[PDB]
């Protein structure tokens, strides 16, 4: 059905112009939905708005109904339990002394007995892939590794929505693929919805749903193969189409037309091979 719904909402920071205005959208259950757009004007605030950190300016027209629990000042902590966030900067989010302490921070806050905490933290750290660094200090960890630990902290609590607030912005284009693969495998295994608010459209190219934000208002919602062909809209808004679609555009200008169903390297190599054969 529908897991997370925001409708008829608008937020002003504390303030010369509404950052979010009349935003209305929905999230499918157990699907990868990614928000894209120009920097500011919505991307930076949705994550802190979903779990009741920030608040809508007019609570009368609030409609945040994550998992059927209408968000409000009374029931913030239930949403906090049901939604986890991986923030942008990894250095100033690694709370706790070391790994196996950061990952168990949520369990420590939930007041569960220590042996179960040890079991769960060990299993989660093994699942993420930080088994060999189970007791390393944060200084020794190098960049993307830290993010992995953060994901473990989200994974131990058993959430239902994981929001990546530009979690892969400050990493090299190699570790970003590793973190994307890890997140996809975790989504497949634990069966949890993922909302990836990232400016990098490599993540959006593989997402099940993508939502474009213009100036605080949703502009288009659909599958990546349905929206990215509309290159003029993305260029006017201020976004550059991803690798496979940019290549398709280059071949289209080069004098050869390709079907619009192609979405990634697979079936594109097939289309080119068949075209050469035919």
């Amino acid at each position: 059905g529908s897991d997370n719904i925001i409708s008829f909402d608008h937020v002003t920071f504390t303030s010369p112009r509404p950052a979010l205005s009349d935003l209305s959208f929905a999230i499918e259950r157990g699907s990868w939905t990614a928000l894209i757009g120009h920097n500011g004007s919505g991307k930076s605030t949705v994550s802190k708005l979903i779990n009741g950190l920030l608040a809508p300016d007019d609570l009368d027209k609030s409609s945040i109904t994550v998992d059927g629990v209408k968000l409000g000042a009374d029931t913030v902590w239930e949403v906090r339990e049901k939604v986890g966030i991986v923030f942008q900067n990894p250095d100033n989010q690694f709370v706790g002394a070391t790994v196996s302490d950061d990952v168990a921070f949520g369990l420590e806050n939930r007041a569960v007995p220590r042996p179960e905490m040890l079991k769960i933290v060990a299993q989660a750290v093994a699942d993420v892939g930080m088994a060999d660094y189970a007791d390393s200090e944060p200084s020794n960890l190098s960049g993307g590794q830290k993010q992995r630990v953060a994901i473990a902290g989200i994974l131990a609590v058993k959430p239902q929505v994981i929001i990546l607030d530009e979690s892969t912005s400050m990493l090299d284009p190699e570790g970003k693929e590793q973190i994307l693969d890890l997140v996809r495998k975790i989504k497949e295994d634990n069966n949890l919805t993922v909302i990836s608010i990232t400016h990098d459209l490599e993540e959006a190219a593989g997402a099940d749903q993508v939502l474009v934000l213009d100036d605080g208002q949703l502009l288009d919602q659909g599958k990546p193969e349905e929206i990215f062909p509309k290159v003029e809209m993305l260029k006017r808004i201020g976004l550059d189409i991803p690798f496979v679609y940019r290549l398709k555009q280059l071949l289209k200008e080069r004098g050869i037309v390709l079907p619009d169903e192609i979405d990634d390297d697979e079936k594109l190599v097939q289309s080119l091979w068949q075209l050469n054969s035919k």
Binding site: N39, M170, D172, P173, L239, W273, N276
Partner: protein
Amino acid sequence: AIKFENVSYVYIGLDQLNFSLEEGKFIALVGHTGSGKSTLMQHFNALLKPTSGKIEIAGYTITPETGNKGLKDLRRKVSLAFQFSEAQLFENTVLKDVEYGPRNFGFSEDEAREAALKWLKKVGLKDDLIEHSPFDLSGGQMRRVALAGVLAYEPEIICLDEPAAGLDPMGRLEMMQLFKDYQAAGHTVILVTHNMDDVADYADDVLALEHGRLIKHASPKEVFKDSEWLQKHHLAEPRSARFAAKLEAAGLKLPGQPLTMPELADAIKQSLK
């Protein structure tokens, strides 16, 4: 003509460097994370003087026993742009912050202001945004002013740490285009990026380093000729290169290895013809 002979810094470690970078060309300094890029960063203008060898930079000489007197001329000739410049903003006025660069190298007030306005215009920003406080700048705009303070006094050699770390692709493309245009004027840029696609797109000399030592120094078309070498030395590959490898794994021949997007497009167009 940057020239390093027997350069080695001790006490991150750098040992036994020997190379020569020419003038009027792009330079990309690629290396593994924490494998010596940051140490070689600060030797270009004697932040960290070498413990051996000699450095020749635009007629200036750097030796281990050289003192701190007269280094302002070298820092004029060679400038650095450190990573995450959003934290180095200093003055109260954006114009004052940008003109703070030339004010330390004998530039008069009128010419300092003229250079500051010219370089804000070249970086673009906005014409009406030159008076607000730098702290009031919104995100990426805060980056665009900072580079101006480094690029105000037309340094002969400019050395850049990752400038596009955390920028949208359009902003990164515009920034790289500006840097290439500046290089086209006769200067040299020494750009450091983990992002390999930028190196493949805009470079002429590639300096592949790892483990605190220099390994390869050659044009980008030559450093990517052996994928086994790249895998062995933990160095990434261009996205177009990976696409070419995947396409070749399907049995389709490509006339020459392409690096940039138009090169791959032309190569596959020739292959189908």
